[PDB]
Structure formats: structure tokens, C-alpha cells
Structure 1
Amino acid sequence: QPEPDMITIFIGTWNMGNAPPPKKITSWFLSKGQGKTRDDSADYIPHDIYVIGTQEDPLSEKEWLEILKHSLQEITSVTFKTVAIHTLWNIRIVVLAKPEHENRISHICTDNVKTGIANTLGNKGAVGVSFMFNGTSLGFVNSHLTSGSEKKLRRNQNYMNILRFLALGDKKLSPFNITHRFTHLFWFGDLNYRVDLPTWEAETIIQKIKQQQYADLLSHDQLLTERREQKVFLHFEEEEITFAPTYRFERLTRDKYAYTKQKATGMKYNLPSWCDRVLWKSYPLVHVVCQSYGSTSDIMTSDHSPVFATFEAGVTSQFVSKNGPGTVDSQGQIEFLRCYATLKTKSQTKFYLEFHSSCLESFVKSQEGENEEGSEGELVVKFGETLPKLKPIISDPEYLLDQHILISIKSSDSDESYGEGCIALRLEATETQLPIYTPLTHHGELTGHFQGEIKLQTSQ
């Protein structure tokens, strides 16, 4: 039974509008409807992992699990295993996997974050799940962010609170938030970003949707515009949107957008919007390909339509050598030349680096760097040829070239991280000096850069 090199992952997000689902929801799991849809020839082929995020979910965990599992069994004739389920209020995440994967999946974590204070604490936030699939770490976040067209800044703040405070993955990676803990991170939900056009343009927008002409709407989508301005979701990818806005529909049809202000909306307009989204972030030079991204047309219980996305994702095996795990492999080493951090900080403390990777027995602290002033005001922290030589547990290039080094630059004064990034060991050559680079972030905002050269020695 060979271990897989690649799996497929289904991501679903649905704001159920506090209504039970209809009797058949199979179109969701088949990626059928509008947008980038899955080929009919794949209908009976199960995805390896199904991750279902709901918002405004009125069902008990048991009720929803029975619907999901019976849906997948009808499609695939496979009885899926429940990996995890976690609910905060009416925000839920379910992870299901093919039974063959049960003994490939370990280190399952769940968490939630509640967003806002007082007034604004009580129904918005996120749930998430992480686990290891053989040698690959996977994270999944379902968030229901603040509603309303004039609250994009609140949504961005909700995003920053969720990635700071959601405690998933390896707790030993203490300087790193969820945006650095996983080989593949999927972030989805009712993110509630709107099409920011004048209220008076509602019927014009509906016309454009009927013509399947999305370009002049997407140019005003708040998630795309905020992400282009580095206000939210920095370093996350999204597949091009080619499906109609998924909100706000009259229930029991899809023929009508319900946009006008009502007492039930707090006298707010809900112009047609792409509230319901799937984004991802994978470590550099790991295979990840979006195969589908769309919405269903035939599930009409809610004022939102379900959204699906599917991915091919590279995975690695749980590697054992004669040496590591349990010792180092002296045939392996990672060296750093001409390295320096450029930081945006106005502060003047000394900095050191920490190197974290599951290819090391434990994280490695460098000596302090030498601070200089950049020509445009910046702090440059020079490590020159001073960084430690990293001793991987396994030297086999089929293992080592698939690994990644997380880097934190920390203040000597406070031991607080000022920036985090990631370097792939998937190099063009071994025993050769090659440029490396990562942006540095802190709380998912850009704080600087790390660049230099690497020299990787493997057993080959």
C-alpha cells in the first residue's frame, strides 16, 4: 500500500441562514453549479478529505454529521470517517476523510476565536481544525466575519484577531501564528466582504449578474481591493471568481436578489456580494492547484448559496532512516551566507534569529546580528557568515529537499518576534550557494524581509 504524494481536498462554505438544508445537497460535494466546476467524469471519485464550514447553522452536530456522511456515501459508496467537528455558536467545521486515511491522520487540534468586544462579542468569529497527514501539516479555518457594507475595516480586524489567537498546529512553533504553522492552510467562510458600489446601482448590478458580466463588480469587491492594498489576507491566494454573487437571495428560488433595506436588515442594503469565499496559503514550492471554485444553483433554503473549492495538494511520507528520527545525520547540513534582515521597526534593540523546522531535533537560536542604517531610513540586521550550521535529522535528499525552515527575528531585549517567514529547501542545486528570500510578517502584516544565500548538503 504506497503512501500518497498528492491528495485532493474539498472545501465547502455555506451560510445556512438558520434554516435546515433541503433533502439533497450532493451538488455541493460534486462542485456542480456556476463558476469553475468539476468534470462529470470525476463524480464517483471521492476526495481524500472533505472540510465543511457552515455559518448560521441551526443543526446539532449529530444532525449535520448524519446529512453529510449520508450525502458522501450516496455519491461515492464510501463511509467517511469523522476526523474532527467543532462549533462556536452557529459557526461549525467538520472534517471527514476516507477510511484508508485514518492511520495517516494524527495530532488533531480544534480551536475557536470569538471576535469583537461587548456589543460586537456574541455571534461572529472562527473555528478551526489542524492535523498531520503523514509528513504534511494541514490547517483549516472557517470564519464568519462582521456583516455590513460599511464594516470592511472591522472584518480586517476580525481577520487579524483570528490569525493571532486561533491555537492550532504545533505549539512548539511559539513565534508563529497559523499563517506559518501549516504546509497548507485553507481559510474560508462568510467573510462578508461586499461589492462596494452605490445603493442606487442595485438594479444595474443585478443586470450585470444576469449577463454573467462580473468584471465591473469584482473590481469593487472589498476583499480583492483590501487584499491588493495589503490590508487583509496578505500572502493568501484565491482562485478567480467566475460564479454569480452568493448573497443575498430570496429563499426557495435563485431567481431574485433581495437587496433593499428592511427592519430585519437593520435598514441596511445588501447589494449582491461575494460574501462566501475560499482562500489558501501553502509553504513555498509545495504543489497546490485549485481544481474547482464555484457555487451551487440548486440549494435554496438559505439567502446564501453554498460555495465549493477543491484542491490537489502535495503531501510527503513519515520518513524513517537508520539515523533520524532520534539522532542527527552528519551527511546533512544547512548553511547561510551573506544573510540580512531588513526591518520596518523604528526601534533600536539587538536582534537574533530562531530557525524552526521538523527536519531539526529542536529550534536553533543564532547569535545577535549587527544593526546598520539602510539608505532609505530602514533597520538592516546583518548576520553575514555568522548564522549557525543546521543539523537535519535525515540527510536523504528525497526527504530534505521537501522541507522548510521557519525564521523568526526576535528582540534580544524582549524575546518578542518582530517578523516571521519561511524558506523552502526545494533548491535548484545542492552543495551550491543559492539566493534565498522571504517576506517577514508579524500578526500577518508586513514587517520586513530576510534575504541571503543558502548551501544545502544532502547524502547525494
Structure 2
Amino acid sequence: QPEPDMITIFIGTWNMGNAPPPKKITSWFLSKGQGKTRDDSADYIPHDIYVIGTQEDPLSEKEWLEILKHSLQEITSVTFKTVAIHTLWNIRIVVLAKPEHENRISHICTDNVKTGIANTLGNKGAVGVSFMFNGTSLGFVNSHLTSGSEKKLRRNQNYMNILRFLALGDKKLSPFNITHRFTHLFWFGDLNYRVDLPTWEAETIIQKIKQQQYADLLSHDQLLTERREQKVFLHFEEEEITFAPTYRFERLTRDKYAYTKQKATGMKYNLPSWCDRVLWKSYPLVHVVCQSYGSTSDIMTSDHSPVFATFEAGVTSQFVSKNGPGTVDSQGQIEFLRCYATLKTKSQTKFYLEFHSSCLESFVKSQEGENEEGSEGELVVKFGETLPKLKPIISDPEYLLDQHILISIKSSDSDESYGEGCIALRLEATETQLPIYTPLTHHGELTGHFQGEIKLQTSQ
């Protein structure tokens, strides 16, 4: 029975509006409704993994698990296994997998982050799950961010708190936040970004939605505009939105958007918005393809419609050679040559690198680099040909060319990371000096760049 080199992943996000679901929710898991939808010919084909995020979820874990599992069994005739379930307040994540995957999944982690302070602490935040699927790390975050059209900056702050403080994945990757710990990271939820148009334009916006003319609305979507200005979700992807705004509907129909201010809304307008989103970030040159992104039309218990996204995702096998794991393979080496970091910092400490990768027995610390001044004000840290030669555990090119090296640049004075990035070993050639490059981030914001050349020796 061969190990897979691809899986499909279903991501669902639904703000349930504190109401129980209707009796049938199968359209959600079938990716049917509006937007980029799944072909009917695939309806019986189970996804490998289903990740369900809910917000304002009124159900117990048991109640929702029974609905989800019975839904999938009706669609696929497969009884899915529960990988993980985690709930913070009314924010929940469920991971289900096909039974054949039970002994491919390990290192399951869960965590939550509570956002805000005092007034603003008590219902918003995020839950997450991570695990290994054979040789591939997978992370999933369901966040319910701050509501209200005039709170985009608070949402951006909520995002940074969640990626700083959510403790998923390999804790040995200590310099790295969740945006670097996984081969594939999926971040979804009620992100609560709104279409920023004047209140007076409510009926005009409704008109546009009825005509399925989303361009002039999407150009005012706060998440797209904040991402384009690098204020949030730096280096994440989102599929093009081709479905109507998923909020705010009158319940029990989809014929009406309920946007006007009410005591129940704190006298706030809720212009039709794409509150409910799926984004992802995968390591460089790993296969990931969005095969659906849309909303259901027939689930109407909430003032939000459910959103679905599905993905092809490249995965690798749990590789054993005669040498590693448990020793190095002298036929393998990674050399970083003529490398330099460009940092935005004004500090003047010395810096060193750390190289982290599951292709190494443990992380590797470099010597300190040589600081110079860049022509436009910047710090340039030069490493020359001084960097330690990295000794992978396995030299086989079918393994090594699928690996990645995480890089942290750390202050000698404080041992704090000033920047993190990732280099793919999926090179055009081995035994050949080739350009490499990663942006460097810290707390998910851009802090610099790392560039240079690599020379990779494999057993071939």
C-alpha cells in the first residue's frame, strides 16, 4: 500500500450565530453553492483531512462531532476518525481524517490564544491544531477576530497576537512562530474584515451583489487592502473571491442582507462583507493548489453563510536510510556561500545565524557575521564563506531535494531573533552554486532579507 505524495484537505469556516445548524449541511463539505465550486463527479470522493472551524458555536463538542461525522458518512460512506477537537469559548476547531491515515498522523498539538485586554478579553481569539502527516507538518488556525467596520487595526493586532502566542508544532523550533513551523499552514475564520464603503451606499452594494458584480466591492475589502499594504497576513495566499459577501444575512433566507444599525448590533451598521475567509502559507516550492473556494447557499440558520476551501497539498514519506535517522550520511552536505542578511534594525549588536531543519540531527549555530552599513541606511551582516557545512541525516536526493532550511538571525547580545525565513532545497541542480533568497520576518512583520548562494551535495 503506497504512501501518498499528495492529499486533499477540506477547510470549512462557519460563524453559526449561536444557533443550531439545520438538519442537512452536506453542501458545505461538497463545496457546492457560490464561488469556485467542486465538480459533481467528485461528490463521493472523500478528502483526506477535513478541518472545520466554527465561531459563535452553541453546540457541545459531542453534539457537533456527531453532526460532522454523520454528514461525512452520508456523503462518502466512510467513518472518519477524530484527530483533534479544541474549543475556546464558542470558537472551535475539529480535524477529521480518513481511517487509512490514522497511523500516518502523529505529534498532534492544540492551543488557543485569547485576544484583547479587560473590556476586549472574553470572546475573541483563536484555536489551532497541528500534526505531522508522514514527513509533512500541517498547521490549522481558526480565528474569530474583533468585529466592527472601524476596527481593522484591532483585527491586525489580533492577528499578530495569535501568530506570536499560539504554541503549535515543534517546540524545538524556538525562534520560529507558526508562520514558519509548518510545510502547510491554513488560517481561516471569521476574520471580520469589512467592505469599507459609506453607510449611505448600502442599497447600492446590495444591487451590485444581486448582479454578481463583486469587483467594486472587493477593491474596498479591508483584508485585501490591508494585505496589499503589508499590514497583515504577510506572505499568505488567498484564492480569488467569486462568491457573494457571507455576512450579514437575515436568518432562514439568503434573500436579504440585514445591514441597518440596531440595539442588538450596538447601533453599528453591518454592510455586506466577506467576513469569513481561508488563507494559507506553504514552504517555498511545495505543491499547494486551491481546488474550491466558495460559500453555501442552502444553510441559513446563521447570519453568516458557511465558507469552504479545498486544497491539493504535497506530502512526503517518513524516510529511512541505512544511515539516518540516528546518524549523518557523509554523502550529503549543504553549503551556504557569500551569504548576507540585510536588516531594518537600528541596533548595532553582532548577529549569528541558526539553521533549523528536520534533515539535521539538531539546529546549527553559525559564527558571528561582519556588520557593514548599506548605502541607503541599512544594516548588512556578511557571513562570507564562514558558515558551518550542514550535515543532513539522509543524502538520497529523493529525500533531500524535498527539504527546507529555516534561518533565524539572532543578536549575540540578547539571543533574540531579529528575523526568520525559509530556504527550499528543491534546487535546479546539485553540486552547483545557486542563488537563494528569503525575506526575513519577526512577529510576522518584515525585518529584512537573507540572500546568497547554496551548494547541495546529494548521493547522486
- TM over 0.5: same fold? yes
1:428 deviation in Å?
Answer: 0.1
Residue deviations 1:195-231, cap 9 Å, x none?
A: 0000000000000000000000000000000000000
Deviations 1:295-318 (CA, angstroms, capped at 9, x unpaired): 000000000000000000000000
Question: 1:333-391: per-residue Cα shift (whole Å, max 9, x none)?
Answer: 00011100000000000000000000000000000000000000000000011111000
- Alpha-carbon distance, 1:118 to partner: 0.1
CA distance in 1 between partners of 2:169 and 2:295 (Å):
30
Q: How far off its partner does 1:329 sit?
A: 0.1
> 2: CA distance between counterparts of 1:137 and 1:285?
15
What is the CA distance between 1:70 and its match in structure 2?
Answer: 0.1
Q: Which residue of 2 aligns with 1:320?
A: 320
SS at match of 1:168: coil
DSSP 3-state at the match of 2:273? coil
Superposed displacement of residue 284, structure 1: 0.1
1:57-95 per-residue CA deviation (whole Å, 9 max, x = no partner) reads 000000000000000000000000000000000000000
Give the secondary-structure state (helix, strand or coil) at the position aligned to 1:146. Answer: coil
1:13-41 Cα offsets, whole Å, 9 max, x none, are 00000000000000000000000000000
1:397-456 per-residue CA deviation (whole Å, 9 max, x = no partner) reads 000000000000000000000000000000000000000000000000000000000000
Dislocated runs of 4+, deviation >2 Å: none
CA distance in 2, matches of 1:228, 1:162: 20
Q: Cα deviation per residue 1:141-168 (whole Å; 9 max; x = unaligned)? A: 0000000000000000000000000000
CA drift at 1:192? 0.0
Q: Distance in 2 between matches of 1:336 and 1:12?
A: 41
Residues 228-263 of structure 1, C-alpha deviations (whole Å, 9 max, x = no match): 000000000000000000000000000000000000
Aligned residue for 2:18, secondary structure, equals coil
The 5 Å alignment of 1:33-182 reads: 33-182=33-182
The residue number in structure 2 matching 1:198 is 198
Name the residue aligned to 1:384: 384
Separation (CA, whole Å) in 1 of partners of 2:427 and 2:58: 49
Where structure 1 has 5 or more consecutive residues not aligned to the other structure, the ranges are none
Provide the C-alpha distance between the structure 1 equivalents of 2:359 and 2:437, rounded to a whole number of angstroms.
19
SS of equivalent residue, structure 2 residue 253? coil
Rounded to whole Å, the distance in 2 between the matches of 1:110 and 1:338 is 40
SS in 2 for 1:17: coil
Supply the distance in 1 between the matched residues of 2:257 and 2:138 (Cα, whole angstroms): 36
| Partner Cα separation in structure 1 for residue 334 and residue 99 of structure 2 | 38
Q: CA deviation at 1:128?
A: 0.1
Q: Within the alignment, does 1:412 sit opposite 2:412 as a pair?
A: yes
**Structure 2: gaps spanning 5 or more residues:** none
Distance of 2:422 and 2:414 partners within structure 1: 22
User: Match of 2:435, SS?
Assistant: strand
Q: CA deviation at 1:181?
A: 0.1
SS class of match (2:63): helix
Residue matched to 2:272: 272
SS at match of 1:231: coil
Distance in 2 (CA, whole Å) between partners of 1:432 and 1:132 is 32
Looking at structure 2, the residues matched to 247 and 191 of structure 1 have their Cα atoms a distance apart, in angstroms, of 12
Write the distance in 1 (CA, Å) between the matches of 2:267 and 2:17.
Answer: 18
Q: Is 1:257 the equivalent of 2:274?
A: no
The separation in 2 between residues aligned to 1:144 and 1:252, in whole angstroms, is: 23
d(CA) in 1 for partners of 2:336 and 2:305? 50
Cα deviations by residue, 1:260-296 (Å, 9 ceiling, x for unpaired) = 0000000000000000000000000000000000000
- 1:104-138 residue CA offsets vs partner (Å, 9 max, x unmatched): 00000000000000000000000000000000000
CA distance in 2, matches of 1:338, 1:363: 20
In 2, distance between residues paired with 1:388 and 1:215?
A: 51
Deviation at 1:321, TM superposition (A): 0.1
In the alignment, the residues of structure 2 paired with residue 90 and residue 235 of structure 1 have an alpha-carbon distance, to the nearest angstrom, of 29
CA distance in 2, matches of 1:66, 1:394: 43
RMSD between superposed Cα atoms in Å: 0.2
CA distance in 2, matches of 1:2, 1:18: 44
Length, aligned pairs only: 460
Q: CA deviation at 1:96?
A: 0.1
Helix, strand or coil for the counterpart of 2:216? helix
Q: 1:25 maps to what in 2? A: 25
Q: 2:434 aligns to what?
A: 434
SS at match of 1:388: coil
TM-score relative to the length of structure 2? 1.00
* 1:10 alignment partner in structure 2: 10
In structure 2, how many angstroms separate the alpha carbons of the residues matched to 1:179 and 1:417?
14
For residue 2 of structure 1, report the CA deviation from its aligned partner: 0.1
1:445 alignment counterpart = 445
Report SS of the residue matched to 1:161: helix
* Cα distance, 1:169 vs structure 2: 0.1
* Secondary structure of the corresponding residue to residue 346 of structure 2: coil
Give the distance between the partners of 1:95 and 1:343, measured in 2 at CA. 39
Partner residue in 2 for 1:372 = 372
Match of 1:108, SS?
Answer: strand
